[PDB]
Design a protein around this ligand. Structure first.
Ligand SMILES: *[C@@H]1O[C@H](CO)[C@@H](O)[C@H](O)[C@H]1NC(C)=O
Length: 386
């Protein structure tokens, strides 16, 4: 409705005041009760999900500011991309991520690139450039004490509602803006991925969800607030698994907006969960990786959440663009070589243009004191969007 005022997607909802659902919110019904039927409908539903997530847990994601400039220099195989961002009131900030390049002549369209939060914790293949993004400089994340601290808040104000992770997304968007105006950086901006581990894996999922120029999203052991769902983690903690949950996470750090504090004890009233956050990546590609050795990561919750998110890619006819691999037997953020073929399949297909198959959806089912029962959490039947 109201397309004449708001555009093709109408008056998408940012709140659902009467919502109360203990199970996972239905991806395929808009807030107004209209069922999704076409692939085009997904674009609008994703925009509504973005608004809902910003309202309930992420805070406001600002658009591109009026000033974004960049200069580039290189020494050896390391480039420095010096970025300036500024508002209409003259306020500016600056940040200078670095890029590690493969040696020699690049492909005709430039190097594919992975934006790695704090360097990431995945092995990046030799033909892919790595941009090291200091997300912690953009928004600090030491503890609750970090609220409103970081470069983002030196531009927008320390009381701006963006969570630290939303501020990090904004920084990624400025990085891509900078790359698109800097041909001497020799990056194929159509082949950009994002990755991070642990808290930075929560961040990488947010970046891929909200920044549609990211071709491949790779969250690694992101846990609660990442590829786990709030509702499923509450079920886990109530049944004796020592998981991180919504109640604890908002007191531990600043990864979510202060408004989320009003909902952490009332999760059924939140008209989204992280299966919808992950689904915002669709129709682009994502594979996330989890580790069952650490109950803190909420293992069942990640498998259930990603199974629910997967229905969106299934409904869009592109199930193999979304992967999930969950194993045990290795230290947190150590990369197990057993998962390298799955990681490389996604990188090879979606960043390197190879004909790799990407059907990866596996778990060991080692969930501790709970089990995953899909019928207890997923109530919708996946439509074939036209
Ligand atoms: C329901 O909301 C969606 C998203 O704003 C919109 O595309 C759709 O047209 C709405 N339905 C009606 C009947 O207006």
């Amino acid at each position: 409705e109201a397309e004449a005022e708001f555009g093709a997607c109408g008056a998408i909802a940012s709140t659902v005041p009467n919502y109360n659902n203990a199970k996972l919110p239905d991806p395929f019904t808009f807030a107004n009760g209209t069922a999704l039927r076409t692939k085009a409908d997904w674009s609008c539903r994703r925009a509504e999900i973005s608004a809902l997530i910003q309202n309930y847990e992420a805070g406001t994601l600002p658009p591109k500011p009026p000033v974004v400039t960049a200069s580039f220099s290189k020494s050896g195989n390391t480039g420095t991309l010096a970025i300036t961002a500024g508002l209409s009131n003259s306020q500016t900030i600056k940040f200078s991520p670095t890029i590690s390049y493969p040696s020699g002549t690049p492909p005709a369209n430039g190097w594919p690139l992975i934006i790695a939060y704090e360097g990431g914790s995945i092995p990046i293949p030799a033909g892919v450039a790595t941009l090291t993004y200091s997300n912690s400089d953009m928004a600090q994340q030491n503890s609750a004490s970090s609220r409103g601290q970081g470069l983002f808040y030196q531009l927008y104000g320390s009381t701006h509602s963006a969570s630290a992770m939303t501020a990090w997304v904004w920084g990624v968007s400025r990085i891509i803006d900078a790359l698109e105006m800097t041909p001497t950086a020799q990056i194929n901006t159509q082949r950009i991925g994002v990755t991070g581990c642990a808290r930075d894996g929560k961040g990488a999922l947010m970046a891929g969800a909200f920044e549609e120029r990211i071709a491949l999203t790779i969250p690694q052991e992101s846990g609660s607030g990442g590829d786990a769902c709030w509702r499923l983690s509450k079920y886990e903690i109530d049944n004796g698994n020592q998981v991180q949950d919504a109640v604890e996470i908002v007191g531990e750090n600043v990864w979510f907006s202060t408004n989320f504090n009003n909902y952490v004890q009332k999760l059924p009233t939140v008209p989204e969960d992280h299966h919808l956050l992950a689904a915002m990546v669709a129709p682009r590609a994502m594979i996330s990786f989890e580790n069952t050795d650490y109950l803190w990561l909420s293992p069942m919750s990640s498998f259930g959440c990603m199974t629910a998110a997967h229905t969106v890619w299934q409904g869009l006819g592109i199930a193999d663009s979304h992967g999930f691999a969950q194993v045990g037997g290795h230290a947190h953020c150590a990369w197990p070589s057993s998962l390298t073929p799955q990681l490389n399949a996604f990188i090879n297909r979606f960043l390197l243009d190879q004909s790799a198959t990407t059907n990866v959806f596996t778990t060991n089912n080692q969930f501790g004191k709970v089990q995953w029962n899909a019928a207890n959490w997923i109530t919708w039947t996946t439509p074939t969007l036209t």
